[PDB]
């Protein structure tokens, strides 16, 4: 059911520091090569009053290149699919938590996402929009408690020139008990490839590849 080319559709709804929004997206990629692009639009509550960059990693692990000998748990979860839940703790006390459902219908991946951001300082780089995308990330993947966990430190580049840091923990759970992998790493790079002024229209590109640790 996972072809060498696959599209996806995404609906995200959320709030950050009280500001409500919805985003719709359509994307496409090559799941066995670890590569994907997407076009996204803010459909309600745009222009966003905070950094797009805190949303970009919430907006697709079906598209991770896996060697032969690492069970690709997330592809094997389809057509039913998988749920994930995440928390990002940012250095200045900001917090993002995400709940997500992924499935496959009519030959395309369907993503349904709920995002809540809170406690970001008003004078911070997130509410002031002073960020400049993510550095490459390596996610520590390991089985625990019948689910696949991931942990990562992410570094958001700052326009003034430093970095702004977040510690991340996610639980990924297939809807049927398909084969969990052993411990490994997933190397990411995510790039914003286009945005309009106010970031109500945004394109992204991501590559991700798994490897033994
Ligand atoms: Cl169908």
Residue numbers in the entry: 7 to 65, 69 to 222
The authors write:
To create a further red-shifted monomeric RFP, we investigated whether the AYC motif could red shift the emission wavelength of the far-red emitting RFP mPlum. mPlum is a member of the mFruit family of monomeric RFPs derived from DsRed and differs from mCherry by 13 mutations (excluding N- and C-terminal tags). Its fluorescence emission wavelength (λem) of 649 nm is the longest of the mFruits and is red-shifted 38 nm compared to that of mCherry (λem = 611 nm). Ile65 and Glu16 appear to be major contributors to mPlum’s long emission wavelength as replacement of either residue results in an up to 40 nm hypsochromic shift. These residues interact through an H-bond between the side chain of Glu16 and the acylimine carbonyl oxygen atom of Ile65, and this interaction gives rise to a dynamic Stokes shift that is responsible for the far-red emission wavelength of 649 nm. Chromophore maturation in mPlum results in a mixture of protein molecules containing either the red chromophore (λ = 588 nm) or the green chromophore (peaks at 391 nm and 506 nm).
Transplanting the AYC motif into mPlum to generate mPlumAYC resulted in a mutant protein that was completely deficient in red chromophore maturation; i.e., red chromophore formation was essentially undetectable by either absorption or fluorescence spectroscopy. The absorption peak corresponding to the anionic red chromophore, which is at 588 nm in the spectrum of mPlum, is absent in the spectrum of mPlumAYC. This variant instead displays peaks centered at 396 nm and 508 nm; the 396 nm peak corresponds to the neutral green chromophore, and the 508 nm peak corresponds to the anionic green chromophore. When excited at 508 nm, mPlumAYC displayed yellow fluorescence at 527 nm with a quantum yield of 0.02, and no red fluorescence was detected with excitation at 590 nm. For mPlumAYC, however, no such peak is observed, indicating that the intermediate blue species does not form and that the second oxidation reaction does not occur. Thus, introduction of the AYC motif into mPlum prevents red chromophore maturation by inhibiting the second oxidation reaction, which results in a dim yellow fluorescent protein containing only the green chromophore. The structure of mPlumAYC demonstrates that the intended π-stacking interaction between Tyr197 and the chromophore was successfully introduced. The centroid-to-centroid distance between the Tyr197 phenol ring and the chromophore phenol ring was 3.0 Å and the interplanar angle between these rings was 12.3°. In mPlumAYC and mPlumAYC-E16A, the presence of Tyr197 blocks the space where the NZ atom of the Lys70 side chain in mPlum-E16P and mCherry would sit. In these AYC motif-containing proteins, the side chain of Lys70 forms three H-bonding interactions: one with the side chain of Glu148, another with the side chain of Tyr197, and a third with a water molecule. The AYC motif therefore appears to lock the side-chain amine of Lys70 into a position over 6 Å away from the chromophore.
